[PDB]
Amino acid sequence: MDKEAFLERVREGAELIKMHIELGHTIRLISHRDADGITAGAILAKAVAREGGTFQLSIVKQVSEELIDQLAREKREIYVFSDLGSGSIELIEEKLNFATVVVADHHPPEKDSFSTDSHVLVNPVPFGANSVRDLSGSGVAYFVAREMNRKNRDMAYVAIVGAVGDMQEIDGTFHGLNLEIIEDGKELGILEVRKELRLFGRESRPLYQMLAYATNPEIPEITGDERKAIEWLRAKGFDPEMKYWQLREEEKRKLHEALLVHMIKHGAPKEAIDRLIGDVVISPLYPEGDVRHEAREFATLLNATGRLNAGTLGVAICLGDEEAYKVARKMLDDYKKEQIEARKFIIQNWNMVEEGEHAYVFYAGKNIRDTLVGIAANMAINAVVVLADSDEDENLVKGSARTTEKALEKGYHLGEALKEVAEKLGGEGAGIRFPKNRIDEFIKLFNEAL
Amino acid sequence: EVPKEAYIIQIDLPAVLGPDMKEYGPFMAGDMAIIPTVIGRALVEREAARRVRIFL
């Protein structure tokens, strides 16, 4: 993997950042929206702050031409892209040529490096590293921060959270440079690796829900149906209302044995069975039973804050801000409540939908928020197109369409035709935004679209 | 030196000169930034910013 050649780039980028900090410049950080990007941004923000420097961090959905235009118009001395940028080397080199830029990323890059000086690409991939298992974005951010200052090793766990968010340990164990990071954590006592049930929900979920929506691996005849999960858990002598962390080690072992027996007996694939028990990263820095205590659960929290346009709040959580954790809990709870109320509203008012030859259309008005549209449609299925007035715009309606394989049996491709109708109505086209005064015109154009 | 803290900015904000003769901003809504406390605190009381604690 030629680690020395990668470390050369790492040291270069780190040195650049430190140089600009010592010059008193504002380090302009830009990172991605998921757990990997949020943890990366946190790591770099702490790296800058620890040197007594000044940063400005933005958590974005993706690097776009418009975003690069905005950043360019900002006229900074230095831009650092985290978990982003590799697919946009020329763009960044084109519009940010006037400034120092560092790209710390792990996605397969458009080029091997930048062509001009003062622009450094810190990416393990051009050195032979596997993008999806050797290091995540937060991982390379961690390497850079560590080269900046060894103290930043105290962010190891944070990095690993990102790593788990990026599913770098999809096969039940860590690989490549990730391992290094893990060791750092181990040396500090800020993380530990357990051989346990790799499923989501060991900290905050009842056993029955931990089994119910288990993916990677999936549990045959248990995944999906919570009732069967409850029955199965009561049968094997477990408290289905109990949480995994509350189990003793022997009880955990018995759970593993029982689940493995079940999956073998119901013809689960060997890979899935081999992925049931494996590495699970824990941190003594947080109380057991807390979502931050385990990497996957922490990553789940962060992703959740990311989707609700509060990625920076998640960053603050990674930085050790308890207040931000509180606010985030409140926010997620309120969101959940909104979801419940949306389900209740749409089920109670299913008498307002429009009967189509190819689709259903439910206009909720202002009663269901934009973001809740899609999940509303699904909730109308598990009990289809939903529309709602946009909160941002005023003359705009945002809508989402959901469907199953039974529809795919005869094409019925939603995203295909939705693009057509959105094109006809003068809107973007999956989900669709279009003029509120053309809803009727949408409906007719959607039945014919399929 | 000028006292500064870390904040989450709630709304879009144009660039602003600080007591250290350095430019802070412009800010996109939701940006996290280290800015001089005199400005940050006023932004917080105006409810345009939130303090965030970075434990070092």
Fold classification of A3-188 (topology level) = inorganic pyrophosphatase (n-terminal core) (3.90.1640)
Instruction: DSSP letter for A243, please.
Output: B
**Resolution reading in Å:** 2.6
d(CA A246, CA A288) in angstroms, rounded, equals 9
- Chain B residues lying within 8 Å of A46, measured CB to CB: 54, 56
Residue type, B12: D
**Backbone dihedral region for residue B40 (phi beyond 0: left; psi -120 to 50: alpha; all else: beta):** alpha
SS (H, E, C) A351-406: HHCEECCCCEEEECCCCCCCCCHHHHHHHHHCCCEEEEECCCCCCEEEEEECCCHH
d(CA A26, CA A28) in angstroms, rounded, equals 6
A330 by Cβ neighbours in 10 Å (0-12 / 13-18 / 19+) ranks as exposed
d(CA B2, CA B37) in angstroms, rounded, equals 8
Contact present, A146 and A15 (Cβ < 8 Å): no
| C-alpha A166: how far from chain center | 8
**Pairwise CB contact (< 8 Å): A57 & B54:** no
d(CA A18, CA A392) in angstroms, rounded, equals 40
Query: In CATH terms, is domain A346-448 a member of 3.10.310.30?
Result: yes
B33 touches chain A (CB under 8 A): yes
A319 touches chain B (CB under 8 A): yes
Query: What are the structural domains, with CATH classification, of chain B?
Result: 1-56 (3.40.5.50)
The bridge status of strand A78-82 relative to strand A100-104 is parallel
The technique by which this structure was obtained is: X-ray
- Chain B residues lying within 8 Å of A313, measured CB to CB: 8
Instruction: DSSP letter for A51, please.
Output: T
Helix (H, G, I), strand (E, B) or coil at A171: coil
d(CA A358, CA A402) in angstroms, rounded, equals 13
d(CA A370, CA A367) in angstroms, rounded, equals 10
Q: Which residues contact A309 (CB under 8 A, 6 or more apart)?
A: B30
Count CB neighbours of B45 within 10 A. 9
Which residues does residue A58 pair with via DSSP β-bridges, in sequence order? A30
d(CA B31, CA B13) in angstroms, rounded, equals 10
The answer to whether A3-188 and A346-448 have equal CATH topology is no
Nearest CA to A413 among A399, A425, A402?
A: A402
- Chain B residues lying within 8 Å of A44, measured CB to CB: none
CA distances from A377 to A9, A311, A345, A363, A372 (A): 48, 26, 12, 11, 9
